[PDB]
Amino acid sequence: MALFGYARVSTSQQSLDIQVRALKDAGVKANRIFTDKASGSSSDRKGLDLLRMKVKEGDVILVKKLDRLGRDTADMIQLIKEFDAQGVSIRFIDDGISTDSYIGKMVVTILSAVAQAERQRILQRTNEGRQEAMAKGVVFGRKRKIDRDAVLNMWQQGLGASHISKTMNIARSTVYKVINESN
Amino acid sequence: ALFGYARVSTSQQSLDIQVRALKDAGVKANRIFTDKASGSSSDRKGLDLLRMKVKEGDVILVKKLDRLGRDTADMIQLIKEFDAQGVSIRFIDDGISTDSYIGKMVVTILSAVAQAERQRILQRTNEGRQEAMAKGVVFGRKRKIDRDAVLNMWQQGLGASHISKTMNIARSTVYKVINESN
Amino acid sequence: ALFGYARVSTSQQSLDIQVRALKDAGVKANRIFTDKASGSSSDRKGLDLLRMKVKEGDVILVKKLDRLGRDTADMIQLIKEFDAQGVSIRFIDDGISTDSYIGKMVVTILSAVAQAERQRILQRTNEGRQEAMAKGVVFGRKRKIDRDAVLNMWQQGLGASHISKTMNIARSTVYKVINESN
Amino acid sequence: MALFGYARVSTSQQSLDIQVRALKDAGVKANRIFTDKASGSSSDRKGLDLLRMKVKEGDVILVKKLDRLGRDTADMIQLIKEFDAQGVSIRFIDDGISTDSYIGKMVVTILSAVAQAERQRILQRTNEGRQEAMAKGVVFGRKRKIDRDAVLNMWQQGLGASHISKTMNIARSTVYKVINESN
DNA sequence: TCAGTGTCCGATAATTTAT
DNA sequence: TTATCGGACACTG
DNA sequence: TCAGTGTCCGATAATTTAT
DNA sequence: TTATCGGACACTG
DNA sequence: TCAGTGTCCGATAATTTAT
DNA sequence: TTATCGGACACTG
DNA sequence: TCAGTGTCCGATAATTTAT
DNA sequence: TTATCGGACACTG
């Protein structure tokens, strides 16, 4: 009954807001909502790490979808098991299912398990996608901003780099690089 | 390299059916590994060892799901581990293996369905403890010492470092029989 | 308005335990329907009747999944029929209901898991008998008629009707004992 | 392996090609690929009907994803029952499994079971969707086309309905309804 | 009254492949 | 995944 | 060389309740 | 669970 | 030769709600 | 889900 | 009124194989 | 799966 929220994001679609509104619509107050922008690091999840420090027997954490609490089924089951012993349950808003009962945890598991397999089948199709596009001749990576014909045409003209980097507005690091590559 | 694993938790120590089934499947005694729950923490030292002696390409065998893993959490981790190591599990009766992605899923599912049905039995077993507990069924090891001779000889005056020598019981139990019977 | 349903398929006709559970659950005996599968094609009249006598709002109780249904297809059908008719099923031991969307899914999954486990047991039993027609083992009902009193009487010049009257057996059999003992 | 294909479509996204492509890519001849586009009417899947009349023992039908062959899970489980007692088996490309074995069927069943659940959950959100908009004020249905301020302005004037529906290009049914509906 | 050149990374910024 | 940015150094004179 | 008396746990052994 | 088995202390006179 | 009038559908077409 | 077409009827004058 | 004789099934009871 | 009961024929003279 001592309600808590949790929201998480992993891509450009930082609609963390859309998550937090979903949380507040469900009666969780800003007071006890915990956020995580997974900066792509091994496991730098501060928000959560702070959530399990304040919850005590009685409380109920809320999350919007399954694939938020946990990246992978193995991790997520441990989390639930911990909490359970601690005396706290998790309610999933969109899935409309929850950890308080036994057939509850069962469904949760069954559900994220079908997720993970689907997740992985996509991951493979995405890597082959890169191969039949990479060998195809498609170009990957940041589009080139710099007018390089304006670097060659300025160095072959006598002038030194420090000068070139100031008149044009770019780092000197780049100027020399542009030179050594065009041989 | 093929490996076996068998485990037991109750009086039905047919570790033999398991160990035989594994042999039939082609596992040499040489690499079959055994554990038998004494009811301690997780002194599954036989398992602990088997996972030391495995390398990329090895395959472990087990007769049924609920052997390897007690709870689905513990189970999934063990596979997550073995998998990283380059090793797979093939379950004989359940007829599936951690070999593929779908494989793992079906394992994960079946244990999850098991744990569930296994929990309901526990709570049912427990509810039944109470419909015979208050009914009047006595619990414990059945009494064996003749208590109509311990109190019959102590009240006569004979010492307590002598009555345990006449009969065949410990000196701890004579003082327990006297004190408790008030 | 509550209803019950119990069913039985083997010697363990503890059809009572079921109806005790359905009365302990709060169904009036008025509303507890019953069937007992002889093993014939499909003679479940009790159900046939129940599904005629229920209206929107009613709930049917049943003790375990594997009662309402032999196989998972039938199982879903029954549910579907009831569903469009304003009635829902509640499985006791299992502790789930066809009340909701998730509700039905869970049921479906469970039966599917069960069916697989069921067809594996069938193929094992089926290899079990096969591989035990190599040693003994003697199948069939145990012989009762004194066959050493039939030959012993027929070689004595006596005729088959006499032998059927004297020993209280069928003339069908008199000849069969003989023609199957050369 | 008598190979066969099957593709199906239910919305504007009639990318029937993508499916038929997937099938050919997987190794079916157009010679044995079969096609159905539902029109929303009761049930008119004449294409499948045809194919299950032409298969025999040994044959294998291919399909791109689960939700193509079967609408609801019973209907799905029944086709398979039919096909099974016939000596055919279905392979699902993207889901990477087939009715081939016992465990096979189980997985198929479990998966569509999940599908149908999450599909109904979507559908009820679509329907509470038209409610946070129905009572919000929005008007549903076809946009009104007949100029009504010329039907009533022509009727109080006195003229009969028959003359009203002949002058303006409207059916006499619509005249009466418009009148009876607005007073 | 120190100052200019050129090299070598780790951060940071935009970009592709897929449901 | 490739591009640029901002600095840290190690040289020269 | 007490030399016995009395209490107070940590191991084991035999049991019960249920699929 | 409850019953026994072997001890370890902490005191006696 | 009705010949005009008013009602009550089943079919179609055009629309909105959403992942 | 609401807006129109075409008809099918059952009446009147 | 035969009156007797043998052969060949379909239904059930008992009994096996396994969880 | 087998063992047996009650019969339904087909034969028998």
PDB file of C-alpha atoms in Angstrom, chain D residues 10-115:
ATOM      1  CA  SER D  10      -6.307  -8.195 -43.018  1.00  0.00           C
ATOM      2  CA  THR D  11      -5.530  -4.438 -43.288  1.00  0.00           C
ATOM      3  CA  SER D  12      -4.468  -1.616 -45.677  1.00  0.00           C
ATOM      4  CA  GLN D  13      -0.916  -2.952 -45.357  1.00  0.00           C
ATOM      5  CA  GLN D  14      -1.542  -5.458 -48.179  1.00  0.00           C
ATOM      6  CA  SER D  15       2.153  -6.297 -48.328  1.00  0.00           C
ATOM      7  CA  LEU D  16       1.108  -9.726 -49.553  1.00  0.00           C
ATOM      8  CA  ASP D  17       4.357  -9.460 -51.530  1.00  0.00           C
ATOM      9  CA  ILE D  18       6.610  -9.474 -48.442  1.00  0.00           C
ATOM     10  CA  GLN D  19       5.005 -12.770 -47.426  1.00  0.00           C
ATOM     11  CA  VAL D  20       5.074 -14.349 -50.904  1.00  0.00           C
ATOM     12  CA  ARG D  21       8.673 -13.140 -51.148  1.00  0.00           C
ATOM     13  CA  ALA D  22       9.648 -14.698 -47.828  1.00  0.00           C
ATOM     14  CA  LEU D  23       8.073 -17.970 -49.006  1.00  0.00           C
ATOM     15  CA  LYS D  24       9.861 -18.053 -52.393  1.00  0.00           C
ATOM     16  CA  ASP D  25      13.106 -17.049 -50.676  1.00  0.00           C
ATOM     17  CA  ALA D  26      12.573 -19.988 -48.303  1.00  0.00           C
ATOM     18  CA  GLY D  27      12.224 -22.213 -51.389  1.00  0.00           C
ATOM     19  CA  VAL D  28       8.651 -22.591 -52.566  1.00  0.00           C
ATOM     20  CA  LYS D  29       7.614 -22.407 -56.214  1.00  0.00           C
ATOM     21  CA  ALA D  30       4.844 -19.898 -57.085  1.00  0.00           C
ATOM     22  CA  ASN D  31       3.483 -23.161 -58.463  1.00  0.00           C
ATOM     23  CA  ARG D  32       2.293 -24.093 -54.930  1.00  0.00           C
ATOM     24  CA  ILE D  33       1.884 -20.812 -53.001  1.00  0.00           C
ATOM     25  CA  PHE D  34      -1.634 -19.915 -51.826  1.00  0.00           C
ATOM     26  CA  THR D  35      -3.292 -16.604 -51.042  1.00  0.00           C
ATOM     27  CA  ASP D  36      -6.174 -15.062 -49.071  1.00  0.00           C
ATOM     28  CA  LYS D  37      -7.305 -11.504 -48.325  1.00  0.00           C
ATOM     29  CA  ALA D  38     -10.100 -11.250 -45.784  1.00  0.00           C
ATOM     30  CA  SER D  39     -12.821  -8.706 -46.567  1.00  0.00           C
ATOM     31  CA  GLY D  40     -14.159  -8.615 -42.978  1.00  0.00           C
ATOM     32  CA  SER D  41     -17.095 -10.876 -43.887  1.00  0.00           C
ATOM     33  CA  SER D  42     -18.035 -13.807 -41.575  1.00  0.00           C
ATOM     34  CA  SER D  43     -15.310 -16.110 -42.992  1.00  0.00           C
ATOM     35  CA  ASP D  44     -14.321 -16.530 -46.634  1.00  0.00           C
ATOM     36  CA  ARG D  45     -10.917 -18.213 -46.699  1.00  0.00           C
ATOM     37  CA  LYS D  46     -11.351 -20.021 -50.042  1.00  0.00           C
ATOM     38  CA  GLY D  47      -7.569 -20.206 -50.539  1.00  0.00           C
ATOM     39  CA  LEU D  48      -6.684 -22.262 -47.480  1.00  0.00           C
ATOM     40  CA  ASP D  49      -9.721 -24.465 -48.154  1.00  0.00           C
ATOM     41  CA  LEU D  50      -8.231 -25.263 -51.558  1.00  0.00           C
ATOM     42  CA  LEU D  51      -4.755 -26.085 -50.235  1.00  0.00           C
ATOM     43  CA  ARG D  52      -5.888 -28.502 -47.529  1.00  0.00           C
ATOM     44  CA  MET D  53      -7.710 -30.399 -50.261  1.00  0.00           C
ATOM     45  CA  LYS D  54      -4.508 -30.907 -52.232  1.00  0.00           C
ATOM     46  CA  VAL D  55      -1.958 -31.998 -49.625  1.00  0.00           C
ATOM     47  CA  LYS D  56      -0.971 -35.603 -48.831  1.00  0.00           C
ATOM     48  CA  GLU D  57       1.369 -37.589 -46.536  1.00  0.00           C
ATOM     49  CA  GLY D  58       4.917 -36.171 -46.585  1.00  0.00           C
ATOM     50  CA  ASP D  59       3.914 -32.659 -47.665  1.00  0.00           C
ATOM     51  CA  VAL D  60       5.058 -29.541 -45.737  1.00  0.00           C
ATOM     52  CA  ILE D  61       3.185 -26.216 -45.715  1.00  0.00           C
ATOM     53  CA  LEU D  62       5.211 -23.077 -44.881  1.00  0.00           C
ATOM     54  CA  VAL D  63       3.924 -19.828 -43.283  1.00  0.00           C
ATOM     55  CA  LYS D  64       5.760 -16.608 -42.364  1.00  0.00           C
ATOM     56  CA  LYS D  65       4.424 -15.854 -38.858  1.00  0.00           C
ATOM     57  CA  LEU D  66       1.879 -17.512 -36.553  1.00  0.00           C
ATOM     58  CA  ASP D  67      -0.863 -14.889 -36.699  1.00  0.00           C
ATOM     59  CA  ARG D  68      -1.343 -15.610 -40.416  1.00  0.00           C
ATOM     60  CA  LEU D  69      -2.561 -19.201 -40.482  1.00  0.00           C
ATOM     61  CA  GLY D  70      -4.729 -18.940 -37.399  1.00  0.00           C
ATOM     62  CA  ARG D  71      -6.959 -16.192 -36.059  1.00  0.00           C
ATOM     63  CA  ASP D  72      -7.895 -17.676 -32.667  1.00  0.00           C
ATOM     64  CA  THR D  73      -6.010 -20.491 -30.870  1.00  0.00           C
ATOM     65  CA  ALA D  74      -8.763 -23.117 -31.013  1.00  0.00           C
ATOM     66  CA  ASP D  75      -9.109 -22.589 -34.795  1.00  0.00           C
ATOM     67  CA  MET D  76      -5.318 -22.876 -34.952  1.00  0.00           C
ATOM     68  CA  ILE D  77      -5.212 -26.094 -32.843  1.00  0.00           C
ATOM     69  CA  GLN D  78      -7.967 -27.575 -34.999  1.00  0.00           C
ATOM     70  CA  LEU D  79      -6.263 -26.984 -38.362  1.00  0.00           C
ATOM     71  CA  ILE D  80      -3.227 -28.680 -36.963  1.00  0.00           C
ATOM     72  CA  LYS D  81      -5.353 -31.581 -35.693  1.00  0.00           C
ATOM     73  CA  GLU D  82      -6.730 -31.906 -39.254  1.00  0.00           C
ATOM     74  CA  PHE D  83      -3.345 -31.572 -40.928  1.00  0.00           C
ATOM     75  CA  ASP D  84      -1.784 -33.928 -38.401  1.00  0.00           C
ATOM     76  CA  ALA D  85      -4.153 -36.846 -39.025  1.00  0.00           C
ATOM     77  CA  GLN D  86      -3.277 -36.298 -42.676  1.00  0.00           C
ATOM     78  CA  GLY D  87       0.493 -36.648 -42.438  1.00  0.00           C
ATOM     79  CA  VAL D  88       1.397 -33.010 -43.054  1.00  0.00           C
ATOM     80  CA  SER D  89       3.264 -30.644 -40.759  1.00  0.00           C
ATOM     81  CA  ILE D  90       3.567 -26.884 -40.675  1.00  0.00           C
ATOM     82  CA  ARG D  91       6.817 -24.898 -40.477  1.00  0.00           C
ATOM     83  CA  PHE D  92       6.731 -21.309 -39.264  1.00  0.00           C
ATOM     84  CA  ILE D  93       9.579 -19.220 -40.636  1.00  0.00           C
ATOM     85  CA  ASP D  94       9.990 -16.287 -38.283  1.00  0.00           C
ATOM     86  CA  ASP D  95       9.007 -18.209 -35.116  1.00  0.00           C
ATOM     87  CA  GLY D  96      11.572 -20.900 -36.082  1.00  0.00           C
ATOM     88  CA  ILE D  97       9.527 -23.968 -35.064  1.00  0.00           C
ATOM     89  CA  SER D  98       7.138 -26.548 -36.504  1.00  0.00           C
ATOM     90  CA  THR D  99       4.189 -28.833 -35.655  1.00  0.00           C
ATOM     91  CA  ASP D 100       6.737 -31.504 -36.562  1.00  0.00           C
ATOM     92  CA  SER D 101       6.925 -33.154 -33.122  1.00  0.00           C
ATOM     93  CA  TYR D 102       5.027 -33.261 -29.790  1.00  0.00           C
ATOM     94  CA  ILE D 103       7.092 -30.545 -28.088  1.00  0.00           C
ATOM     95  CA  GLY D 104       6.710 -28.690 -31.387  1.00  0.00           C
ATOM     96  CA  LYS D 105       2.928 -28.414 -31.129  1.00  0.00           C
ATOM     97  CA  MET D 106       3.219 -27.447 -27.441  1.00  0.00           C
ATOM     98  CA  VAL D 107       5.440 -24.463 -28.210  1.00  0.00           C
ATOM     99  CA  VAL D 108       3.156 -23.363 -31.120  1.00  0.00           C
ATOM    100  CA  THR D 109       0.154 -23.574 -28.762  1.00  0.00           C
ATOM    101  CA  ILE D 110       1.856 -21.683 -25.877  1.00  0.00           C
ATOM    102  CA  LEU D 111       3.003 -18.941 -28.274  1.00  0.00           C
ATOM    103  CA  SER D 112      -0.384 -18.302 -29.910  1.00  0.00           C
ATOM    104  CA  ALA D 113      -1.894 -18.418 -26.462  1.00  0.00           C
ATOM    105  CA  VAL D 114       0.285 -15.503 -25.508  1.00  0.00           C
ATOM    106  CA  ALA D 115      -0.413 -13.730 -28.808  1.00  0.00           C
TER     107      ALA D 115
END
